[PDB]
PDB file of C-alpha atoms (C1' of nucleotides) and ligand atoms in Angstrom:
ATOM      1  CA  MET D   1       0.000   0.000   0.000  1.00 44.25           C
ATOM      2  CA  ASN D   2       1.474   3.218  -1.239  1.00 44.02           C
ATOM      3  CA  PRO D   3       2.068   6.126   1.166  1.00 43.15           C
ATOM      4  CA  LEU D   4      -0.038   8.461  -0.920  1.00 43.60           C
ATOM      5  CA  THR D   5      -3.032   6.369  -0.155  1.00 42.42           C
ATOM      6  CA  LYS D   6      -2.327   6.875   3.521  1.00 42.24           C
ATOM      7  CA  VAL D   7      -2.323  10.609   2.931  1.00 42.26           C
ATOM      8  CA  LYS D   8      -5.622  10.261   1.069  1.00 42.67           C
ATOM      9  CA  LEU D   9      -7.125   8.068   3.761  1.00 42.51           C
ATOM     10  CA  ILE D  10      -6.640  10.690   6.440  1.00 41.91           C
ATOM     11  CA  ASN D  11      -8.129  13.334   4.160  1.00 42.29           C
ATOM     12  CA  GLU D  12     -11.129  11.169   3.395  1.00 42.61           C
ATOM     13  CA  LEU D  13     -11.485  10.667   7.125  1.00 44.68           C
ATOM     14  CA  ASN D  14     -12.063  14.422   7.365  1.00 39.81           C
ATOM     15  CA  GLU D  15     -14.342  14.778   4.319  1.00 38.06           C
ATOM     16  CA  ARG D  16     -16.428  11.842   5.465  1.00 39.25           C
ATOM     17  CA  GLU D  17     -16.832  13.505   8.853  1.00 38.15           C
ATOM     18  CA  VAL D  18     -18.103  16.659   7.165  1.00 41.02           C
ATOM     19  CA  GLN D  19     -20.626  14.752   5.059  1.00 38.51           C
ATOM     20  CA  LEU D  20     -22.026  12.929   8.040  1.00 41.43           C
ATOM     21  CA  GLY D  21     -22.159  16.016  10.212  1.00 42.90           C
ATOM     22  CA  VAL D  22     -20.221  14.720  13.202  1.00 45.32           C
ATOM     23  CA  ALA D  23     -19.736  16.996  16.203  1.00 45.85           C
ATOM     24  CA  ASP D  24     -16.280  17.919  17.402  1.00 43.83           C
ATOM     25  CA  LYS D  25     -16.722  16.328  20.794  1.00 43.43           C
ATOM     26  CA  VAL D  26     -16.935  13.009  18.966  1.00 43.91           C
ATOM     27  CA  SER D  27     -14.540  13.738  16.127  1.00 41.15           C
ATOM     28  CA  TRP D  28     -11.869  11.197  15.237  1.00 35.70           C
ATOM     29  CA  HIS D  29      -9.198  13.509  16.681  1.00 38.31           C
ATOM     30  CA  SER D  30     -10.879  13.200  20.080  1.00 36.67           C
ATOM     31  CA  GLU D  31      -9.336   9.764  20.454  1.00 36.09           C
ATOM     32  CA  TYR D  32      -5.921  11.483  20.435  1.00 36.09           C
ATOM     33  CA  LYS D  33      -6.878  14.352  22.755  1.00 37.32           C
ATOM     34  CA  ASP D  34      -4.553  13.151  25.521  1.00 36.56           C
ATOM     35  CA  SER D  35      -1.387  13.357  23.392  1.00 40.53           C
ATOM     36  CA  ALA D  36       0.422  16.359  21.875  1.00 37.87           C
ATOM     37  CA  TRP D  37       2.702  14.384  19.563  1.00 39.85           C
ATOM     38  CA  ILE D  38       2.376  14.232  15.785  1.00 38.84           C
ATOM     39  CA  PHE D  39       4.078  12.009  13.227  1.00 40.01           C
ATOM     40  CA  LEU D  40       5.331  13.632  10.066  1.00 42.65           C
ATOM     41  CA  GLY D  41       6.252  11.312   7.269  1.00 42.79           C
ATOM     42  CA  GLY D  42       7.556  11.484   3.787  1.00 44.14           C
ATOM     43  CA  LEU D  43       9.722  14.529   4.328  1.00 42.45           C
ATOM     44  CA  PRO D  44      12.425  15.426   1.859  1.00 43.77           C
ATOM     45  CA  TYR D  45      15.810  14.396   3.067  1.00 45.28           C
ATOM     46  CA  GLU D  46      17.265  17.844   2.515  1.00 44.09           C
ATOM     47  CA  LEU D  47      15.121  19.358   5.237  1.00 45.27           C
ATOM     48  CA  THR D  48      16.729  19.861   8.574  1.00 48.52           C
ATOM     49  CA  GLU D  49      15.037  20.408  11.872  1.00 51.46           C
ATOM     50  CA  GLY D  50      15.100  24.154  11.586  1.00 50.74           C
ATOM     51  CA  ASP D  51      13.014  23.766   8.466  1.00 49.48           C
ATOM     52  CA  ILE D  52      10.469  21.475  10.121  1.00 49.67           C
ATOM     53  CA  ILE D  53      10.110  23.810  13.076  1.00 49.19           C
ATOM     54  CA  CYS D  54      10.026  26.815  10.775  1.00 49.02           C
ATOM     55  CA  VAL D  55       6.969  25.507   8.928  1.00 50.20           C
ATOM     56  CA  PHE D  56       5.023  23.578  11.560  1.00 49.00           C
ATOM     57  CA  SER D  57       5.168  26.633  13.801  1.00 47.05           C
ATOM     58  CA  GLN D  58       2.222  28.143  11.955  1.00 45.97           C
ATOM     59  CA  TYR D  59      -0.144  26.439  14.321  1.00 42.49           C
ATOM     60  CA  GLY D  60       1.576  26.900  17.609  1.00 45.58           C
ATOM     61  CA  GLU D  61       4.695  26.567  19.632  1.00 45.60           C
ATOM     62  CA  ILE D  62       6.812  23.485  19.176  1.00 45.40           C
ATOM     63  CA  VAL D  63       8.107  21.957  22.379  1.00 47.29           C
ATOM     64  CA  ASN D  64      10.202  19.063  21.103  1.00 47.67           C
ATOM     65  CA  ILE D  65      11.422  17.607  17.810  1.00 48.35           C
ATOM     66  CA  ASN D  66      12.625  14.141  16.841  1.00 46.47           C
ATOM     67  CA  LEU D  67      13.747  13.858  13.253  1.00 46.88           C
ATOM     68  CA  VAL D  68      15.017  10.326  13.265  1.00 46.87           C
ATOM     69  CA  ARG D  69      18.330   9.892  11.578  1.00 47.83           C
ATOM     70  CA  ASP D  70      20.464   7.029  10.387  1.00 51.11           C
ATOM     71  CA  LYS D  71      22.796   5.760  13.075  1.00 51.19           C
ATOM     72  CA  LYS D  72      25.865   5.300  10.911  1.00 52.68           C
ATOM     73  CA  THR D  73      25.750   8.159   8.452  1.00 50.11           C
ATOM     74  CA  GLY D  74      23.458  10.500  10.337  1.00 52.51           C
ATOM     75  CA  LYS D  75      21.356  11.282   7.290  1.00 51.16           C
ATOM     76  CA  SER D  76      17.621  11.626   7.669  1.00 53.76           C
ATOM     77  CA  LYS D  77      15.257   8.699   7.447  1.00 53.26           C
ATOM     78  CA  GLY D  78      12.540  11.066   6.300  1.00 50.76           C
ATOM     79  CA  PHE D  79      10.273  10.963   9.332  1.00 51.97           C
ATOM     80  CA  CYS D  80      10.163  12.872  12.615  1.00 52.84           C
ATOM     81  CA  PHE D  81       7.917  13.409  15.640  1.00 56.50           C
ATOM     82  CA  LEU D  82       6.886  16.855  16.863  1.00 57.53           C
ATOM     83  CA  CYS D  83       5.443  17.852  20.205  1.00 58.12           C
ATOM     84  CA  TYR D  84       3.327  20.959  20.364  1.00 57.58           C
ATOM     85  CA  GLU D  85       2.736  23.129  23.377  1.00 59.73           C
ATOM     86  CA  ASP D  86      -1.006  23.094  22.821  1.00 60.46           C
ATOM     87  CA  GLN D  87      -2.704  19.822  22.254  1.00 63.12           C
ATOM     88  CA  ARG D  88      -5.159  21.516  19.905  1.00 58.60           C
ATOM     89  CA  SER D  89      -2.375  22.388  17.511  1.00 58.69           C
ATOM     90  CA  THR D  90      -2.231  18.738  16.616  1.00 61.21           C
ATOM     91  CA  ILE D  91      -5.793  18.941  15.324  1.00 63.72           C
ATOM     92  CA  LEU D  92      -4.932  22.016  13.334  1.00 58.97           C
ATOM     93  CA  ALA D  93      -1.798  20.501  11.856  1.00 60.45           C
ATOM     94  CA  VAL D  94      -3.272  17.133  10.975  1.00 61.43           C
ATOM     95  CA  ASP D  95      -6.133  18.840   9.220  1.00 59.31           C
ATOM     96  CA  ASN D  96      -4.257  21.597   7.529  1.00 58.11           C
ATOM     97  CA  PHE D  97      -0.860  20.171   6.759  1.00 59.50           C
ATOM     98  CA  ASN D  98      -1.627  16.633   5.713  1.00 59.34           C
ATOM     99  CA  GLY D  99      -0.719  16.145   2.134  1.00 60.14           C
ATOM    100  CA  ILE D 100       0.934  19.447   1.408  1.00 58.49           C
ATOM    101  CA  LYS D 101       3.945  19.529  -0.857  1.00 57.15           C
ATOM    102  CA  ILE D 102       7.415  20.615   0.206  1.00 60.64           C
ATOM    103  CA  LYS D 103      10.076  20.459  -2.514  1.00 66.09           C
ATOM    104  CA  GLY D 104       7.652  18.496  -4.609  1.00 70.51           C
ATOM    105  CA  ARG D 105       6.889  15.767  -2.087  1.00 69.71           C
ATOM    106  CA  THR D 106       3.659  15.200  -0.224  1.00 70.57           C
ATOM    107  CA  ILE D 107       3.903  14.535   3.482  1.00 73.65           C
ATOM    108  CA  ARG D 108       1.557  12.867   5.888  1.00 75.61           C
ATOM    109  CA  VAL D 109       0.780  14.249   9.308  1.00 77.35           C
ATOM    110  CA  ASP D 110      -1.002  11.951  11.755  1.00 76.72           C
ATOM    111  CA  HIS D 111      -1.695  11.867  15.488  1.00 78.47           C
ATOM    112  CA  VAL D 112       0.681   9.677  17.477  1.00 77.24           C
ATOM    113  CA  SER D 113      -0.502   7.881  20.603  1.00 77.87           C
ATOM    114  CA  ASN D 114       1.664   7.149  23.653  1.00 76.30           C
ATOM    115  CA  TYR D 115       4.894   8.296  21.969  1.00 71.72           C
ATOM    116  CA  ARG D 116       7.799   6.677  23.800  1.00 73.48           C
ATOM    117  CA  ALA D 117      11.009   8.752  24.063  1.00 74.25           C
ATOM    118  CA  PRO D 118      14.506   7.550  23.013  1.00 73.12           C
ATOM    119  CA  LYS D 119      16.790   6.261  25.753  1.00 73.37           C
ATOM    120  CA  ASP D 120      19.904   8.238  26.642  1.00 71.22           C
ATOM    121  CA  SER D 121      21.983   5.072  27.087  1.00 70.20           C
ATOM    122  CA  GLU D 122      23.919   5.999  23.948  1.00 71.61           C
ATOM    123  CA  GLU D 123      26.609   8.668  24.297  1.00 71.25           C
ATOM    124  CA  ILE D 124      26.887   9.130  20.526  1.00 69.69           C
ATOM    125  CA  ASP D 125      26.161  12.872  20.453  1.00 70.46           C
ATOM    126  CA  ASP D 126      25.919  15.829  22.849  1.00 71.80           C
ATOM    127  CA  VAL D 127      23.478  18.128  21.038  1.00 71.56           C
ATOM    128  CA  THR D 128      20.957  15.283  20.968  1.00 71.69           C
ATOM    129  CA  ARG D 129      21.348  14.972  24.745  1.00 70.07           C
ATOM    130  CA  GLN D 130      20.633  18.688  25.074  1.00 73.44           C
ATOM    131  CA  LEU D 131      17.588  18.307  22.813  1.00 71.53           C
ATOM    132  CA  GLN D 132      16.226  15.354  24.787  1.00 70.30           C
ATOM    133  CA  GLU D 133      16.776  16.709  28.298  1.00 70.81           C
ATOM    134  CA  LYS D 134      15.997  20.371  27.532  1.00 68.95           C
ATOM    135  CA  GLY D 135      14.550  20.698  24.018  1.00 66.23           C
ATOM    136  CA  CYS D 136      13.829  23.713  21.838  1.00 66.39           C
ATOM    137  CA  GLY D 137      11.821  26.466  23.483  1.00 63.76           C
ATOM    138  CA  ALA D 138      11.538  30.186  24.157  1.00 63.27           C
ATOM    139  CA  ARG D 139      13.742  31.412  27.010  1.00 63.36           C
ATOM    140  CA  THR D 140      12.775  34.475  29.044  1.00 63.19           C
TER     141      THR D 140
ATOM    142  C1'   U I   1     -64.873  70.751  34.116  1.00 63.83           C
ATOM    143  C1'   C I   2     -68.206  66.894  32.071  1.00 65.90           C
ATOM    144  C1'   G I   3     -68.114  63.964  26.246  1.00 67.42           C
ATOM    145  C1'   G I   4     -68.222  56.249  26.335  1.00 68.43           C
ATOM    146  C1'   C I   5     -70.183  53.728  18.363  1.00 71.50           C
ATOM    147  C1'   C I   6     -72.027  47.842  17.926  1.00 70.17           C
ATOM    148  C1'   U I   7     -74.480  42.388  20.049  1.00 66.88           C
ATOM    149  C1'   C I   8     -79.304  38.801  14.708  1.00 66.31           C
ATOM    150  C1'   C I   9     -82.229  35.665  11.346  1.00 66.16           C
ATOM    151  C1'   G I  10     -83.330  32.732   6.609  1.00 66.14           C
ATOM    152  C1'   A I  11     -82.125  32.295   1.290  1.00 66.12           C
ATOM    153  C1'   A I  12     -78.222  32.339  -3.136  1.00 66.90           C
ATOM    154  C1'   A I  13     -74.690  24.270  -2.092  1.00 65.49           C
ATOM    155  C1'   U I  14     -75.299  18.777  -1.622  1.00 66.20           C
ATOM    156  C1'   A I  15     -80.562  18.848  -7.567  1.00 64.77           C
ATOM    157  C1'   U I  16     -84.689  17.251 -10.136  1.00 66.10           C
ATOM    158  C1'   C I  17     -88.061  13.589 -12.154  1.00 67.32           C
ATOM    159  C1'   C I  18     -90.657   8.687 -12.841  1.00 65.37           C
ATOM    160  C1'   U I  19     -92.955   3.884 -10.784  1.00 63.52           C
ATOM    161  C1'   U I  20     -95.249   0.896  -6.499  1.00 64.85           C
ATOM    162  C1'   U I  21     -96.714   0.983  -1.425  1.00 64.14           C
ATOM    163  C1'   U I  22     -96.877   3.840   3.365  1.00 62.32           C
ATOM    164  C1'   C I  23     -98.362   8.542   6.402  1.00 62.81           C
ATOM    165  C1'   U I  24    -101.022  12.607   6.274  1.00 63.24           C
ATOM    166  C1'   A I  25    -103.641  17.112   3.779  1.00 61.28           C
ATOM    167  C1'   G I  26    -107.940  18.859   0.859  1.00 59.89           C
ATOM    168  C1'   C I  27    -112.310  18.002  -1.264  1.00 58.67           C
ATOM    169  C1'   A I  28    -117.575  16.771  -3.646  1.00 58.32           C
ATOM    170  C1'   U I  29    -122.251  14.045  -5.440  1.00 55.71           C
ATOM    171  C1'   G I  30    -126.938  11.174  -5.958  1.00 56.61           C
ATOM    172  C1'   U I  31    -136.499  11.771  -6.861  1.00 57.55           C
ATOM    173  C1'   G I  32     -37.829   1.774 -56.985  1.00 57.74           C
ATOM    174  C1'   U I  33     -33.871   5.502 -54.509  1.00 57.36           C
ATOM    175  C1'   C I  34     -30.568   8.918 -52.373  1.00 58.82           C
ATOM    176  C1'   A I  35     -30.795  12.320 -48.374  1.00 56.35           C
ATOM    177  C1'   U I  36     -34.348  14.946 -44.352  1.00 57.56           C
ATOM    178  C1'   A I  37     -38.551  16.031 -40.659  1.00 58.58           C
ATOM    179  C1'   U I  38     -43.076  13.935 -39.032  1.00 56.92           C
ATOM    180  C1'   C I  39     -47.121  10.511 -37.870  1.00 55.47           C
ATOM    181  C1'   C I  40     -48.529   5.500 -36.212  1.00 56.79           C
ATOM    182  C1'   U I  41     -46.926   1.100 -33.796  1.00 55.37           C
ATOM    183  C1'   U I  42     -44.092  -2.938 -31.340  1.00 58.56           C
ATOM    184  C1'   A I  43     -41.151  -5.446 -26.889  1.00 59.51           C
ATOM    185  C1'   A I  44     -46.053  -7.294 -18.970  1.00 61.18           C
ATOM    186  C1'   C I  45     -38.811  -2.898 -22.034  1.00 62.40           C
ATOM    187  C1'   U I  46     -36.732   0.160 -17.592  1.00 62.01           C
ATOM    188  C1'   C I  47     -36.729   4.569 -13.190  1.00 61.52           C
ATOM    189  C1'   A I  48     -30.170   5.681 -11.032  1.00 59.99           C
ATOM    190  C1'   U I  49     -26.213   3.608  -8.270  1.00 58.50           C
ATOM    191  C1'   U I  50     -22.268   2.560  -3.381  1.00 58.69           C
ATOM    192  C1'   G I  51     -19.889  -3.051  -6.347  1.00 59.32           C
ATOM    193  C1'   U I  52     -10.660  -3.481  -2.882  1.00 61.99           C
ATOM    194  C1'   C I  53     -10.007   1.913  -8.993  1.00 61.59           C
ATOM    195  C1'   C I  54      -5.310   2.473  -4.082  1.00 61.86           C
ATOM    196  C1'   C I  55      -2.342   1.754  -8.708  1.00 63.53           C
ATOM    197  C1'   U I  56       1.269   7.075  -7.260  1.00 64.06           C
ATOM    198  C1'   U I  57       7.118  10.466  -3.935  1.00 67.42           C
ATOM    199  C1'   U I  58      14.757   7.405  -3.054  1.00 66.58           C
ATOM    200  C1'   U I  59       9.916   7.749   1.519  1.00 63.25           C
ATOM    201  C1'   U I  60      10.229   3.758   5.515  1.00 64.99           C
ATOM    202  C1'   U I  61       5.962   5.148  13.369  1.00 61.77           C
ATOM    203  C1'   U I  62      11.458   6.428  16.627  1.00 67.89           C
ATOM    204  C1'   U I  63      15.583   2.939  21.645  1.00 67.98           C
TER     205        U I  63
HETATM  206 MG1   MG W   1     -78.085  29.909  -7.794  1.00 70.84          MG
HETATM  207 MG1   MG W   2     -79.216  35.870  -8.122  1.00 71.74          MG
END
RNA sequence: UCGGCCUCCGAAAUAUCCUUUUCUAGCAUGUGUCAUAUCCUUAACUCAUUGUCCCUUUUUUUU
């Protein structure tokens, strides 16, 4: 099953909801209300984390970022997890940003449930340790 | 300084007429063809549907 059909399946999830007239208290997103983590998939490999944060900031303030990278070479696998400060920004981003094109590639944005953080057992990098323990965020 | 109108009945809508009984009312008497419309007709002719199209981008939900 091609990834584009996954992008289309989330969009049809939304259109179908509109046709049936479902209320927001029982929307599909309400199953993911507890979490503030969203999966982004299909990204171009040229994008770095400043790019991801630069664009997905339209809907709120990003708390943490996990663009998963190859262990040996360090290059990007293409998918990362973002945590928003508001949980409602996840609704806005899954609706609005699913299936948009960046450098000619469509991306899928979906809610992630019970996201489990990476263990700091590895001492491979330092900046990743800073990102895990502290993470990106405005400083007064 | 005063200032106080009206009130309802029927008809024009469910006909009319004929026949036999029933009820009652009222009386009166007695030394062939090309190329175009149209008309008619035929077939117990039908009155929408939801039945993986998932196929596609170097793209792949993280110890
Ligand atoms: Mg008349
Ligand atoms: Mg008259």
